[PDB]
């Protein structure tokens, strides 16, 4: 696994930005750190925590759906509505369809269908105004590795290294990628920007983004520490 490697890379990137005290500059020039080409390929656009019974269902921005079940397995339904991928507790991956699957997955496929319907009828799509980055052969559709909720946010850890943090109080969100070394920030008003983290060090940023990057570092440390 490059999972621990990617989390450490992210802690590197966040520590350096946070150590530079970026909201504490004389003149902050946040816009100089923007790079629209660093926007993620994938992020979580909807989610429903039904972990008291089944697990966590979610939709990614490409309209694929997934569930992280309480037994730590994952089922993904691609946006063709037909292909599935199953990921076991130990990460072993297998491929199936709605018409070709082992009997052992029938309940979990049905659960995914109920989650899919719930999300479609009730939940707003986060990032609906964002065009995702073009995918290429080096990237694969990710699954939800793990998640947790604090009093102030839900933290979502994807299998491509990305970490997403949705804040409950004001609906602001961060998408962190340790390969781009970038953070996408969605503010309360649904405006979005993607910044190269090294450049936020140089140019600074507002107290709002600085505060959420401090919180992000603590959450990533929390993810690594449980691993």
């Amino acid at each position: 696994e490059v999972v621990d490697c990617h989390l450490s890379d992210m802690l590197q990137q966040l520590h350096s930005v946070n150590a530079s005290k970026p909201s504490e500059r004389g003149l902050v020039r946040q816009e100089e750190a923007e790079d629209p080409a660093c926007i993620p390929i994938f992020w979580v656009s909807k989610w429903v925590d039904y972990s008291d019974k089944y697990g966590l269902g979610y939709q990614l921005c490409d309209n694929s759906v997934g569930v992280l079940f309480n037994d730590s397995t994952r089922l993904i339904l691609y946006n063709d509505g037909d292909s599935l991928q199953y990921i076991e507790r130990d990460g072993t991956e297998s491929y199936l369809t709605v018409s070709s699957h082992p009997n052992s997955l029938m309940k979990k496929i049905t659960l995914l269908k109920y989650f899919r319907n719930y999300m479609s009828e009730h939940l707003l799509k986060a990032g609906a105004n964002i065009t995702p980055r073009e995918g290429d052969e080096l990237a694969r559709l990710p699954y939800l590795r793990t998640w947790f909720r604090t009093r102030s946010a839900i933290i979502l850890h994807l299998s491509n290294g990305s970490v997403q943090i949705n804040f409950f109080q004001d609906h602001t969100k961060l998408i962190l990628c340790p390969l781009m070394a970038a953070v996408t920030y969605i503010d309360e008003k649904r405006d979005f920007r993607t910044y190269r983290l090294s450049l936020l060090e140089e140019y600074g940023c507002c107290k709002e983004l600085a505060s959420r990057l401090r919180y992000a570092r603590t959450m990533v440390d929390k993810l690594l520490s449980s691993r």
Binding site: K46, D52, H122, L123, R149, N166
Partner: peptide
Amino acid sequence: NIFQSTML
């Protein structure tokens, strides 16, 4: 109960 992201 159940918790979820931002509703329509």
